[PDB]
Chain length 182, copies 4
């Protein structure tokens, strides 16, 4: 059985098995554009549920990555059909952290939004009743939100780790605080 | 750019870049429970849309797999939270083809539904207006439905394979016809 | 508090309060294009849940109606953006009952698909774990699927009533049987 | 044809054709819990899309309402199944404006979030590529955000009102600004 859920980007360069060292078959995997955990996405939350409730997975990694098409698209004006809907959530995050991102060098803005996004998705994941329950019923379950850079390993935006709803609060607000340091 | 969208199951026992000899960086990936393409799932369809429109991918592989817990769960009566919703589509598929599955021995059954599912999902994928437009505007785009025999090689063909909406009808209906007659 | 959930079409001529005689405030209302209950629609199922679990509603009416734009669109070839995704579920129903509908007079085909649709949505609704639970925990909860005709009151396609998962099976397969009589 | 899409809450205490003096047959309606327009909700957005593209509606009224159980539930910690997912968007809105709501007395709070929600939802509705395209192609389309005071008249203005994407930014941001400053 798998012990890890990897929520990553569909992006071809970011596959769990090569960013991780996990034994073959340890990785339950969900990938979607910009590694989102939208509150009302049955797709992702079904994986999270199946992971958490069927497989009793104890680690969920939301891995985002740099130079992520989703993030760029989120920030772009292009009509990408359904992607617009999907990335609107990311734009929400973008707008929510507009103070911070406005400051940043336009190019780095994408990479910040990637870091932030992961934070937000973990925050989303961790506020899921799926995860909140796993915890509430004392199941061990750690959420991690990382950002993998194509040319750099993990951005050490480590930030995003929750093992409880409370640690989520701290980690999340903490990560957001860290990222705001500039 | 990658050349394949791989829509597969979140089941680790199916790592795409490994089980195809394809390069890492060549598989745009979406995985979800029982590798579904639900008409109204922005998650998957965003991946597809990103794949088809942004990456201009030419091959969408929906790859199911045997001993897929998704498929098993669909056939269980067990309340698996959000997953029940997700898997009710698979149960539609089960019941849609209940007669075929009725005829089958109750283990063959799972692996049949697994194959059928791939077909249904290809069919869904191909009636996507995303995929349909790609085709309508001459975008070379083939849909492929495979099942990875988890305990084995790899059924590099469920027969379902569409390079157009019409080839979709044929391939799919033929696949179903076939799978209904061994 | 409301005692009835009305899942109807967004169609302006089909508002619950005027097709029903219910006291002001008795109607929890969800309407969407072609009054669907898609397994993985958080929107509708949230209303169903809220209805069933918060409001302890004891009656869910999926009211469809004749000359329903959704149904027509379902059957039509038009690109209606997100509507295509949404009505693809209805097309599924259409294709699932293609034998029956193929027979029918093209015009009546739409009205049959409307009757069928309601059956299917109730079937969907009733296989929801929300409803299955209400029942499993002995809560009184009756699903009704009707089809209101603009010029005729209810099509007496009465069919579609479930007060239990078993009655759903019967009512549903029964309704489908009735509709197949031609 | 109807001239208004009414996006409201499933709460019966809000019947649209009645509370507006509008004709029955003039309100295309979507209702859901806390009258949300989630970027990735095909349900609502299909209604909107049908409204905007098929019915060529010129007014989308998102109408929230006071003592909205949706809003209350969002603010409760209670596990309400699928509804938690649905309401996590409202909780984002709550927390997004936590400071404002922090400042408020904990009852004003609900009715504030109710108003804020309408604004957020209008904002979401207006960043819909559905609505954005209608505008981009000169379709006369105004978005309106109202709150029906359930115990009263009707706040025929939350201030949020957009006839374009730019008027969307202004109206929305202004609404938020306002609601943050009484
Ligand atoms: Zn990416
Ligand atoms: Zn599987
Ligand atoms: Zn209709
Ligand atoms: Zn309400």
């Amino acid at each position: 059985t798998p012990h890890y859920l990897w929520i990553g980007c569909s992006n071809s360069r970011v596959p769990a098995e090569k960013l991780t060292n996990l034994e073959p078959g340890e990785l339950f995997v969900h990938r979607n554009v910009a590694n989102q955990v939208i509150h009302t996405d049955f797709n992702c939350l079904s994986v999270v549920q199946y992971a958490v409730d069927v497989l009793k997975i104890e680690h969920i990694i939301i891995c985002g990555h740099t130079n992520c098409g989703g993030i760029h698209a989120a920030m772009a004006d292009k009509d990408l059909g359904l992607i617009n809907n999907w990335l609107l959530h990311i734009r929400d995050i973008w707008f929510k952290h507009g103070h911070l991102l406005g400051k940043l060098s336009p190019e780095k803005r994408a990479d910040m939004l990637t870091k932030i996004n992961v934070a937000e998705q973990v925050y989303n994941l961790g506020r899921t009743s799926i995860v909140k329950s796993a915890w509430e019923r004392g199941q061990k379950l750690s959420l991690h939100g990382w950002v993998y850079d194509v040319n750099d390993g993990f951005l050490v935006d480590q930030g995003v780790m929750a093992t409880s709803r409370e640690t989520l609060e701290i980690s999340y607000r903490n990560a957001i605080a860290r990222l705001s340091i500039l």
